[PDB]
């Protein structure tokens, strides 16, 4: 069944002063949508709209599942602990003037357990690595018990090994826990790796559809204003495709 629907959406992005028009796309439960674009392309506004911080110029957005969000970073001058951060995800399960209950601590703990980070509960959030921090932020969204999880540049600042852990995690959330995933990225190889659906954002223009239909040399070359070509490969009998940017200096 449907998870999210975006119809005739139109919105302005101040930064680059460009107006997006008639944006359409829908997502079902279990889908993994990659929003592929480069630095300040409107991903920020797009996510804002999906979370409804503000209304769009035209169109409608309908979300059918409880929504969770994961920012790229969490900055605070206060020495909050891992548990403190994750527990905040219980926000909607605690009344305004109430305190979290043992159940709330239970869910947060199982969220950490699910990611095998139980041994981090008491640690000071800022003492963790970038990868552990990002994972802890996914845990707080998980503890909220959302079904539709939106992630802003989840892999961009992590080392390769951690980006790998994150990609595997997102696939597991969609395939095993029947969650719907939406993440922003500028890396096409990560898109073909885990996203069955992709949205390309290029100067007021865009393209949405099945990943294999959208991730093509022609579409990527137009998006990156640099020739990009799909390449086949085989590693120990395992076939796979990836995309390579053609820097003038490679020639």
């Amino acid at each position: 069944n449907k998870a999210l629907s975006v119809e005739n959406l139109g919105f302005y992005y101040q930064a680059e002063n460009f107006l997006f028009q008639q944006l359409n796309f829908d997502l079902n439960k279990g889908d993994i949508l990659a929003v592929l674009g480069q630095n300040g392309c409107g991903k920020s506004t797009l996510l804002d709209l999906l979370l409804g911080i503000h209304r769009p110029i035209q169109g409608k957005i309908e979300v059918y599942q409880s929504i969770g969000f994961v920012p790229q970073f969490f900055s605070s001058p206060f020495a909050y602990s891992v548990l403190d951060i994750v527990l905040m995800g219980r926000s909607t399960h605690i009344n305004t003037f109430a305190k979290p209950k043992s159940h709330d601590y239970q869910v947060a703990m199982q969220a950490l357990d699910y990611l095998n980070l139980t041994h981090l509960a008491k640690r000071e959030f800022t003492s963790l690595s970038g990868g552990q921090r990002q994972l802890i932020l996914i845990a707080r969204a998980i503890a909220s018990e959302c079904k539709l999880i939106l992630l802003d540049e989840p892999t961009s600042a992590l080392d390769l090994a951690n980006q790998d852990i994150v990609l595997s995690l997102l696939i597991d959330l969609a395939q095993s826990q029947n969650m719907t995933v939406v993440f922003t990225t500028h890396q096409p190889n990560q898109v073909v790796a885990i996203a069955n659906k992709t949205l390309l954002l290029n100067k007021q223009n865009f393209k949405f559809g099945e990943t294999r239909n959208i991730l093509t040399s022609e579409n990527l070359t137009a998006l990156f204003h640099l020739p990009m070509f799909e390449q086949q490969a085989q590693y120990k009998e395992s076939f796979f495709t990836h995309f390579v940017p053609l820097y003038k200096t490679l020639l």
Partner: protein, 308 residues
């Protein structure tokens, strides 16, 4: 955690009792008449409890405001409510109002300032700081204007010394006046103990988590400002408290507000009492407690910062 709270709520009592052992007609060895008994019930006790609640209040206000602005260097003065209250009291003194007239005037312009900050807010965090900064400038200029056009014989000295704040003229009438708002505000703030942690959230996550940032910030700003307005009304301008107390508290119980608020209230109460009965001990004359919080606070602030 409980072991720490029980310990702090111990010093609070120990220092309160010890307080009875300072001043004219005091005690010396009684480990807990007819004159002493009356000095305790009608004079000493009233000041002791006033210092305790005011210390707890200013500390409370400081810590919640630090959470709102995500900055440990914030104090209950950035919203401009202290200057607004200072002006309200000054004005009341200038026109020779009554004690009750001073209270109302102090609170009136105190709340009035909050209201102004709110209105200009709707006509970001940094913006609130700038707006309150503008109001403080305006109010401290009006205060200066009044004392400049006031009689230097009696009017002026009254304005000048009231702006220094002290507990020297504290009595049961004032304590009970402040105690009502104090207990009210502190209760709501304590019930929002955990939610205050959500003040550190960014816009997107806050919306996703169903947190109503705007309403929550204002509820806290109002309660925070109400404490200070009522505090200034009965004890004048006291500073260098809300800044350092929450820090010491975070050194004791951590950042989680659910545990921080109660701890800062207790450390603030004891700290103010210690400073107040020093204003008495220190000399034969009553040195306004504002001078002492600054002379003790500032250097203590440095020491706390020194140990990064």
């Amino acid at each position: 955690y409980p072991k720490i709270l029980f310990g702090l709520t111990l010093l609070l009592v120990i220092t309160a009792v010890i307080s009875l052992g300072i001043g004219r007609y005091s005690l010396s060895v009684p480990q807990i008449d007819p004159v002493q008994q009356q000095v305790i019930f009608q004079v000493r006790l009233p000041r002791i409890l006033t210092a305790l609640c005011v210390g707890a209040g200013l500390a409370l206000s400081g810590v919640v405001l630090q959470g709102i602005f995500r900055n440990p260097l914030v104090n209950p003065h950035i919203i401009g409510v202290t200057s607004g209250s200072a002006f309200g009291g000054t004005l009341a003194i200038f026109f020779g109002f009554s004690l009750y007239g001073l209270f109302t005037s102090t609170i009136l312009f105190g709340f009035g300032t909050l209201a102004l900050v709110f209105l200009f807010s709707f006509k970001s965090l940094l913006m609130l700081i700038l707006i309150g900064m503008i109001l403080s400038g305006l109010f401290s200029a009006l205060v200066s204007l009044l004392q400049y056009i006031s009689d230097t014989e009696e009017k002026l000295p009254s304005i000048v010394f009231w702006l220094m704040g002290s507990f020297a003229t504290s009595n049961w009438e004032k304590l009970l006046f402040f105690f009502v708002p104090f207990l009210l505000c502190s209760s709501i703030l304590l019930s929002l103990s955990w939610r205050l942690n959500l003040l550190s959230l960014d816009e997107k996550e806050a919306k996703a988590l169903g947190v109503k940032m705007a309403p929550l910030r204002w509820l806290v700003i109002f309660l925070s400002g109400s404490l200070v307005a009522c505090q200034v009304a009965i004890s004048g301008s006291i500073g260098w408290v809300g800044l350092i107390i929450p820090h010491l508290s975070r050194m004791l119980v951590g950042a989680n507000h659910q545990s921080l608020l109660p701890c800062t209230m207790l450390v603030g109460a004891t700290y103010m009492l210690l400073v107040d009965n020093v204003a008495r001990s220190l000399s034969d004359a009553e040195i306004p407690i504002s001078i002492l919080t600054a002379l003790i606070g500032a250097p203590l602030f440095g020491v706390l910062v020194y140990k990064l």
